Amino acid sequence: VPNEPINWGFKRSVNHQPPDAGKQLNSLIEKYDAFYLGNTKEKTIYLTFDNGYENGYTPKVLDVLKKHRVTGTFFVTGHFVKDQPQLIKRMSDEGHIIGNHSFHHPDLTTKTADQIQDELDSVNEEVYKITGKQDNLYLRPPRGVFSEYVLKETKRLGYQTVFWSVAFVDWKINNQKGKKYAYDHMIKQAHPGAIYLLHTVSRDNAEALDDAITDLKKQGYTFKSIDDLMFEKEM
């Protein structure tokens, strides 16, 4: 299979309609069971987070999710796990899902099968040492970079690759825009079956999320987890 680097990207959602990555990308991901949307036939949103390091707001994000009784899926890197053991424990104890964002967050298309296996297993290994548990195998390619080779290999390793349908610039520490910026994006880009990709390092992201969930729920949206997505898609 080809190993041509591919960066996950797509035209943003418009008019609250699910976005589409195109026929070529849709065919590729489906050939390997990867997905970027959940059930678009109901007003449901699946929250996911990418965690590479901590900037002091994840505890508040966890409090907000608990308050709204929403289950998040956090894709963590080796560094995050090693640096924030207590947070990993909270995610596990509070019913959240811990996804794999690789240990060193490298470009997987440049790693051999053996290297890929180690990059992923090492994260689970450390997570288990902390939680004594292990979630279903979910992966989010570092920097959204992948290829058919990466999808084929990770799937062979039992990993389900999870992309996204909503994301914005909430990861730039040198330019933290505030609550309104993030909130407005989560409301405007909302759509049935949306899988949100959020970060927890920018100023007021927890407060923006709190407001977004509150208002999205009022609109008639229900928040489900990646595990729920997988389960319901099976039945």
UniProtKB/Swiss-Prot annotation:
The NodB homology domain covers which part of the protein? 43-224
Q: How does activity depend on pH?
A: Optimum pH is 7.0.
Q: Where is this site: Raises pKa of active site His?
A: 170
UniProt keyword Metal-binding present: yes
Q: Which domain of life is it from?
A: Bacteria
The record's section on Pfam families has: Polysacc_deac_1
The record's induction entry says:
Expression is sigma G-dependent.
Q: Does the keyword Transcription apply?
A: no
Q: What is its EC number?
A: 3.5.1.-
Q: Which residues form the active site?
A: 50 (proton acceptor), 199 (proton donor)
- What is any one GO biological process for this UniProt entry? carbohydrate metabolic process
Q: Which InterPro entries match?
A: Glyco_hydro/deAcase_b/a-brl (IPR011330), NODB_dom (IPR002509), Polysacc_deacetylase_ArnD (IPR050248), Spore_PdaA (IPR014235)
Which GO molecular-function terms appear in the entry? deacetylase activity; hydrolase activity, acting on carbon-nitrogen (but not peptide) bonds; metal ion binding
Q: Which UniProt keywords apply?
A: Cell wall biogenesis/degradation, Hydrolase, Metal-binding, Signal, Sporulation
The chain's disulfide connectivity reads none
Q: For a divalent metal cation, which residues are the binding ones?
A: 101, 105
- Deletion phenotype: Spores have no muramic delta-lactam structure in the cortex and cannot germinate. Mutant spore peptidoglycan possesses many MurNAc residues lacking peptide side chains.
Q: Which family does it belong to?
A: Belongs to the polysaccharide deacetylase family.
* Its job: Catalyzes the deacetylation of N-acetylmuramic acid (MurNAc) residues in glycan strands of peptidoglycan, leading to the formation of muramic delta-lactam residues in spore cortex, after transpeptidation of deacetylated muramic acid residues. PdaA probably carries out both deacetylation and lactam ring formation and requires the product of CwlD activity on peptidoglycan as a substrate. Is required for germination. Cannot use chitin oligomer (hexa-N-acetylchitohexaose) as a substrate.
Give any extra note attached to this record: CwlD and PdaA are necessary and sufficient for muramic delta-lactam production in B.subtilis spore peptidoglycan.
**The protein, known as:** Peptidoglycan-N-acetylmuramic acid deacetylase PdaA
Give the organism, scientific name.
Bacillus subtilis (strain 168)
Q: Which gene encodes it?
A: pdaA
